[PDB]
Design a binder for this molecule. Sequence first.
Ligand SMILES: CCOP(=O)(OCC)C(=Cc1cc(C(C)(C)C)c(O)c(C(C)(C)C)c1)P(=O)(OCC)OCC
Length: 270
Amino acid sequence: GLTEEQRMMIRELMDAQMKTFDTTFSHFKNFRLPGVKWSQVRKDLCSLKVSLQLRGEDGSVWNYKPPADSGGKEIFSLLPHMADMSTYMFKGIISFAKVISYFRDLPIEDQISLLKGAAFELCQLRFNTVFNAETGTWECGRLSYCLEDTAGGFQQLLLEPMLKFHYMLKKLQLHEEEYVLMQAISLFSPDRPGVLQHRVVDQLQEQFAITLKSYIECNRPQPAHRFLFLKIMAMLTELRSINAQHTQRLLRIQDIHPFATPLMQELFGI
Ligand SMILES: CCOP(=O)(OCC)C(=Cc1cc(C(C)(C)C)c(O)c(C(C)(C)C)c1)P(=O)(OCC)OCC
């Protein structure tokens, strides 16, 4: 059964989510848009295969299809825009953290540390909920990011760790509570550099995992939801690896083509 404390914990997480997650992206506006030798690795954007769509309020539609590489010069046509969306997302994620309580009790520096450590993951997790595995696109309000699938690579070429992550996580068909919980576990990761009260955060993370584990055992009795809790935990360990992988990828690009926003600079190196 689920205890009173567990219940209050979920509600606090759920309350924090609806207060800070603008699922319609209504306040995402005034964002940039693509214009109208060891950089070969800097070509990490090889799987940045996303067409862009914008549903005009008046009913119109703008559709953007990206260029090609082998024209190494300027394949960052989509970076600025992308960075703005990340900032909007991050802002939302920081608001999520600061609105909990177990988080605000932690000393300031510990909040900063945990945030710089989980930003990517928390934002990555939120985007999964607006991801559509059918059309391979991320519905973000009037905005849309369609994967250049059945066009660019091939629907089996999910060799890209992150895409595999989104399809795989979407496949579990998690509930909102589960998403918020695995957003808590990620946020309160005791093993993130610079963490002071690591003993506290660690125990907090255990209470979250225990709650999620409980929730699953108390609301998903069917054979297909066996080991769900572990898959999710493994799923989150994977996410950490991508995170690190990404910070690096992102920094290489920054080292030769500045584009990161002030906020992005805060969270990461710069
Ligand atoms: C068009 C990008 O599609 P996408 O799915 O990855 C494709 C390989 C994607 C990944 C992503 C996520 C982040 C956060 C989570 C840390 C904010 C980024 O900062 C960045 C870049 C590298 C652009 C700086 C990319 P998304 O956040 O796009 C943001 C504009 O969308 C996730 C659904």
